[PDB]
């Protein structure tokens, strides 16, 4: 496996629901590679009988510098217009993945909790959800990482 994840730091946590995600990603590339890396963030909500996902954002890195690389991936937040109110204030998941030439080789999953920023709203939640008061707390120190064996070059 030519590219490996050496560290992931969530820079802004907790944050407002509407704040972009800021991931400081450190990875190593052992050999020169022909193609691009794609980093992608996906939202997964489970409030329905089946899952409903939101692809949030993605960026390409290419060509891949050989050595140790550090950069910040700033990913757009979820669209609350697509999320039922009960799921806005529940535990959800985000998946941070990297693919090489379209082939996913690492996935970092996080639990995310969403709660109001004031005790009185937490215990007396308003009829209409107030997204401006929702704070998201990523469980960033317990990442659930999956690796996949891929063809490289």
């Amino acid at each position, epitope marked *: 496996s030519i590219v*490996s*994840l050496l*560290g*992931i730091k969530v820079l802004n946590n907790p944050a407002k629901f509407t704040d972009p995600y800021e991931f400081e990603i450190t990875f190593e590339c052992l050999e020169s590679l022909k193609h691009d890396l794609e980093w992608k963030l996906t939202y*997964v909500g*489970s*409030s329905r*009988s*089946l*899952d409903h996902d939101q692809e949030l954002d993605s960026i390409l890195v290419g060509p891949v510098p050989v050595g140790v690389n550090k950069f910040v991936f700033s990913a757009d937040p979820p669209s609350a217009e697509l999320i039922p109110a009960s799921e806005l204030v529940s*535990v*959800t*998941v985000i*998946l941070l993945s990297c693919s090489y030439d379209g082939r996913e080789f690492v*996935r970092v*999953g996080y*639990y995310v*909790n969403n709660e109001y920023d004031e005790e009185e709203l937490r215990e007396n939640p308003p009829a209409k959800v107030q997204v401006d008061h929702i704070v998201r707390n990523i*469980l960033a*120190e*317990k*990442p*659930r*990482v*999956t690796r996949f064996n891929i063809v490289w070059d």
Partner: antibody
Amino acid sequence: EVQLVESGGGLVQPGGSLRLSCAASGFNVSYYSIHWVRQAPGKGLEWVASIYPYSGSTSYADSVKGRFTISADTSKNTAYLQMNSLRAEDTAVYYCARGYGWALDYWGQGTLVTVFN
Amino acid sequence: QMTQSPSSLSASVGDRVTITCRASQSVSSAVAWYQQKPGKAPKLLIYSASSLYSGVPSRFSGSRSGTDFTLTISSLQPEDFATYYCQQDGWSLITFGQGTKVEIKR
């Protein structure tokens, strides 16, 4: 080439202690989560403890919190379960397992912990 | 909590069987299925509720419907008679179901 090999099981009396070792082969423990899961004879699987990559953060089953500690030595590429204040309930085969996302892909053969009076 | 049912079932080669676990939360990423035979370590079958682990035969599948997670074996083969466990990896705790022993009819 991936392997996990548990050691350190043995006979111990209540109130005693044991330190289990999980020797990782084919991968670096610092980049994967590592988990201890136990099985009493003829009974089901019971999760004990988890440690997570990059930060060494930990989780514990309620019935072992304050008693067991999970850790990993990156230099030795080995995970540990320090088992303090052991009780009759703790007798089991203890498996070490590697995290695969939210699941567990590779399991060792287990080491037997036998509490006896 | 992960309530697994049935605790055992008897079936024939070629039978389609389903095993269900009822979770306290509906997050799909959190649920996995394992096989275990006497004297052997558990084996991963399904992860993230519905994804088949590499090398597992296609007759195994998993699905989620709300808080019900289901393992289906489309046609039991001789090597499939074993005990099956579901797992939920939650925010704070991992929970295993009590297991389902799949025994062979004669």
